[PDB]
Short mmCIF file of N, CA and C and ligand atoms in Angstrom, two decimals:
data_model
loop_
_atom_site.label_atom_id
_atom_site.label_comp_id
_atom_site.label_asym_id
_atom_site.label_seq_id
_atom_site.Cartn_x
_atom_site.Cartn_y
_atom_site.Cartn_z
N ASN C 4 1.00 -1.33 -0.17
CA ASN C 4 0.06 -0.08 -0.25
C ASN C 4 0.93 1.39 0.14
N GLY C 5 0.77 1.55 -0.96
CA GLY C 5 2.05 2.86 -1.41
C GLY C 5 3.65 2.10 -1.04
N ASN C 6 4.67 3.24 -1.19
CA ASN C 6 5.81 2.75 -0.91
C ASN C 6 6.76 4.14 -1.29
N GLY C 7 6.22 5.15 -1.92
CA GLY C 7 6.95 6.36 -1.88
C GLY C 7 6.13 7.02 -3.30
N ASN C 8 4.87 6.74 -3.70
CA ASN C 8 4.49 7.62 -4.53
C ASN C 8 3.70 8.88 -3.73
N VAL C 9 3.85 8.46 -2.48
CA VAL C 9 3.31 9.65 -1.22
C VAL C 9 4.59 10.03 -0.70
N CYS C 10 5.72 9.28 -0.70
CA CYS C 10 6.77 9.73 0.08
C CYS C 10 7.90 9.86 -0.67
N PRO C 11 8.85 10.96 0.11
CA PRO C 11 10.36 10.89 -0.63
C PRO C 11 11.84 10.13 -0.34
N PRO C 12 12.36 9.82 -1.79
CA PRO C 12 13.09 8.86 -1.77
C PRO C 12 14.10 8.95 -0.50
N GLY C 13 14.57 7.98 0.01
CA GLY C 13 15.44 7.70 0.86
C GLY C 13 14.90 6.98 2.20
N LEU C 14 15.29 7.99 3.45
CA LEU C 14 15.10 7.39 4.62
C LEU C 14 13.54 7.36 5.29
N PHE C 15 13.08 8.45 4.59
CA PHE C 15 11.76 8.71 5.19
C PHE C 15 10.67 8.33 3.60
N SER C 16 11.09 6.92 3.26
CA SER C 16 10.66 6.52 2.17
C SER C 16 8.88 5.68 2.39
N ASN C 17 8.84 5.45 3.73
CA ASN C 17 8.10 4.36 3.98
C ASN C 17 6.52 5.23 4.44
N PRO C 18 5.68 5.20 3.61
CA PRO C 18 4.01 5.00 4.21
C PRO C 18 3.78 4.51 5.12
N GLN C 19 3.20 5.28 6.44
CA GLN C 19 2.93 4.93 7.79
C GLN C 19 1.58 5.50 8.12
N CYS C 20 0.38 4.92 8.58
CA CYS C 20 -0.90 5.77 9.01
C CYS C 20 -0.46 5.88 10.62
N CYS C 21 -0.27 6.93 11.09
CA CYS C 21 -0.07 7.11 12.42
C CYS C 21 -1.17 7.40 13.07
N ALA C 22 -1.31 7.26 14.71
CA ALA C 22 -1.80 8.20 15.45
C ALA C 22 -2.09 9.42 15.51
N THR C 23 -0.95 9.61 15.95
CA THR C 23 -0.53 10.88 15.74
C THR C 23 1.12 11.19 15.52
N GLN C 24 1.43 12.22 15.81
CA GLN C 24 2.82 12.49 15.52
C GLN C 24 3.32 13.57 16.69
N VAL C 25 4.78 13.00 16.89
CA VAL C 25 5.16 14.34 18.09
C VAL C 25 6.59 14.75 17.80
N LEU C 26 6.55 16.18 17.91
CA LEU C 26 8.18 16.51 17.84
C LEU C 26 8.37 16.88 16.18
N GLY C 27 7.64 17.02 15.24
CA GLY C 27 7.85 16.70 14.32
C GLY C 27 8.63 15.67 13.46
N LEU C 28 9.11 14.60 14.43
CA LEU C 28 9.70 13.54 13.60
C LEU C 28 9.49 12.36 14.20
N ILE C 29 8.48 12.44 15.01
CA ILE C 29 8.34 11.19 15.54
C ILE C 29 7.00 10.56 15.33
N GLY C 30 6.70 9.43 14.89
CA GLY C 30 5.48 9.02 14.53
C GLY C 30 4.89 7.98 15.51
N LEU C 31 3.60 7.83 15.70
CA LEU C 31 3.13 7.14 16.52
C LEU C 31 2.02 6.42 16.52
N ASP C 32 1.94 5.08 16.83
CA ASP C 32 0.97 4.22 16.56
C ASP C 32 0.75 3.98 14.89
N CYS C 33 1.95 3.67 14.18
CA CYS C 33 2.06 3.93 12.88
C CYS C 33 1.40 2.52 12.13
N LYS C 34 0.40 2.39 11.45
CA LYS C 34 0.24 1.03 10.56
C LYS C 34 0.34 1.10 9.47
N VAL C 35 1.04 0.49 8.57
CA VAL C 35 1.30 0.89 7.26
C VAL C 35 -0.24 0.46 6.46
N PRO C 36 -0.44 1.08 4.97
CA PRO C 36 -1.81 1.55 4.66
C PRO C 36 -2.81 0.49 4.39
N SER C 37 -3.67 0.62 4.20
CA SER C 37 -4.59 -0.68 3.79
C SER C 37 -5.16 -0.72 2.64
N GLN C 38 -4.42 0.16 1.69
CA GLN C 38 -4.84 0.33 0.40
C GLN C 38 -3.49 1.40 -0.03
N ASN C 39 -2.70 0.51 -1.22
CA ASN C 39 -2.18 1.25 -2.14
C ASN C 39 -2.56 2.94 -2.31
N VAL C 40 -1.49 4.25 -1.77
CA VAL C 40 -1.96 5.10 -2.51
C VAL C 40 -1.06 5.93 -3.19
N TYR C 41 -1.74 6.58 -3.92
CA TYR C 41 -0.90 7.42 -5.23
C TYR C 41 -0.29 8.57 -5.16
N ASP C 42 -1.72 9.20 -4.37
CA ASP C 42 -1.17 10.84 -4.02
C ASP C 42 -1.38 11.12 -2.08
N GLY C 43 -1.41 12.11 -1.84
CA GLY C 43 -1.49 12.68 -0.43
C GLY C 43 -2.89 12.57 -0.72
N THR C 44 -4.06 13.09 -1.89
CA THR C 44 -5.55 12.60 -1.55
C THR C 44 -5.61 11.44 -1.01
N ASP C 45 -5.41 10.59 -1.58
CA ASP C 45 -5.82 8.94 -0.96
C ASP C 45 -5.11 8.73 0.30
N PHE C 46 -3.59 9.93 0.46
CA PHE C 46 -3.03 9.25 1.99
C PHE C 46 -3.49 9.73 3.09
N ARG C 47 -3.75 11.17 2.66
CA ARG C 47 -4.63 11.67 4.12
C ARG C 47 -5.96 11.12 4.16
N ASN C 48 -6.84 10.43 3.10
CA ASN C 48 -8.09 10.02 2.96
C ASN C 48 -7.70 8.53 3.41
N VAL C 49 -6.75 8.04 3.18
CA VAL C 49 -7.01 6.35 3.38
C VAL C 49 -6.50 6.27 4.74
N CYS C 50 -5.88 7.18 5.65
CA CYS C 50 -5.75 7.01 7.03
C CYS C 50 -6.65 7.81 7.45
N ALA C 51 -7.14 8.69 7.37
CA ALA C 51 -8.32 9.57 8.12
C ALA C 51 -9.10 8.74 8.41
N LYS C 52 -9.57 7.15 8.02
CA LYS C 52 -10.65 6.48 8.26
C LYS C 52 -9.89 5.64 9.93
N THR C 53 -9.14 5.23 10.13
CA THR C 53 -8.66 5.16 11.04
C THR C 53 -8.18 6.17 12.31
N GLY C 54 -8.54 7.52 11.87
CA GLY C 54 -8.94 8.53 12.43
C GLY C 54 -6.89 8.65 12.77
N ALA C 55 -5.74 8.33 11.46
CA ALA C 55 -5.02 8.23 11.68
C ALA C 55 -4.11 9.63 10.90
N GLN C 56 -3.07 9.84 10.96
CA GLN C 56 -1.84 10.92 10.00
C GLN C 56 -1.10 10.24 8.94
N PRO C 57 -1.21 11.04 8.16
CA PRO C 57 -0.38 10.23 6.93
C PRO C 57 1.02 10.51 7.27
N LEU C 58 2.24 9.51 7.21
CA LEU C 58 3.67 9.96 7.60
C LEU C 58 4.54 9.28 6.15
N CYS C 59 5.49 9.63 6.61
CA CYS C 59 7.17 9.13 5.63
C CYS C 59 7.85 8.34 6.58
N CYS C 60 8.01 6.96 7.09
CA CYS C 60 8.99 7.07 8.09
C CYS C 60 9.96 6.34 7.83
N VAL C 61 11.18 5.97 8.58
CA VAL C 61 12.27 4.90 7.81
C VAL C 61 11.82 4.00 7.51
N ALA C 62 10.85 3.29 8.39
CA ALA C 62 10.89 1.65 8.26
C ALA C 62 9.37 1.30 7.99
N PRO C 63 9.11 0.06 7.20
CA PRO C 63 7.80 -0.20 6.42
C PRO C 63 6.89 -0.91 7.60
N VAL C 64 8.05 -1.00 8.60
CA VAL C 64 7.24 -2.33 9.88
C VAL C 64 6.25 -0.98 10.80
N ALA C 65 5.19 -1.71 11.28
CA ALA C 65 4.29 -0.88 12.08
C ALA C 65 5.33 -0.63 13.39
N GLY C 66 5.12 0.42 14.23
CA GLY C 66 5.71 0.77 15.13
C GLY C 66 5.04 1.78 16.07
N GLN C 67 5.03 1.45 17.69
CA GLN C 67 4.61 1.82 18.64
C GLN C 67 5.13 3.33 18.19
N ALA C 68 6.41 4.00 17.49
CA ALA C 68 6.73 5.00 17.47
C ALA C 68 8.07 4.82 16.42
N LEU C 69 8.17 5.73 15.53
CA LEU C 69 8.86 5.44 14.58
C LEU C 69 9.44 6.88 13.88
N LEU C 70 10.35 7.35 13.47
CA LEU C 70 11.62 8.78 13.43
C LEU C 70 10.51 8.94 11.82
N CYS C 71 9.28 9.49 12.34
CA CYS C 71 9.03 9.96 10.73
C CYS C 71 8.88 11.41 10.10
N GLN C 72 8.26 11.65 9.10
CA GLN C 72 8.13 12.75 8.77
C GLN C 72 6.68 13.09 8.08
N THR C 73 5.91 14.32 8.23
CA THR C 73 4.39 14.31 7.62
C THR C 73 4.49 14.51 6.35
N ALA C 74 3.61 13.54 5.90
CA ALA C 74 3.57 13.49 4.21
C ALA C 74 3.24 14.67 3.78
N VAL C 75 3.40 14.89 2.36
CA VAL C 75 3.28 16.10 1.62
C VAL C 75 1.75 16.12 0.90
ZN1 LIG Y 108 -3.58 1.94 17.39
ZN1 LIG Y 109 -5.82 10.40 -5.18
#
């Protein structure tokens, strides 16, 4: 479900739907999407479902807290 059609090349390459985010770089309760996203619109909207926040983290694995960045 997405992989970088919504995220930057590199380190914040991985799209996760997250609970919230803190400090501008830590994403929390991050689950990987439930649907391939192609843009921000489907990123923000596919995430919203869970009441979550679209982010681009350094890992593709779900995690309590991950070093993320907010999706564009
Ligand atoms: Zn949760
Ligand atoms: Zn779209």
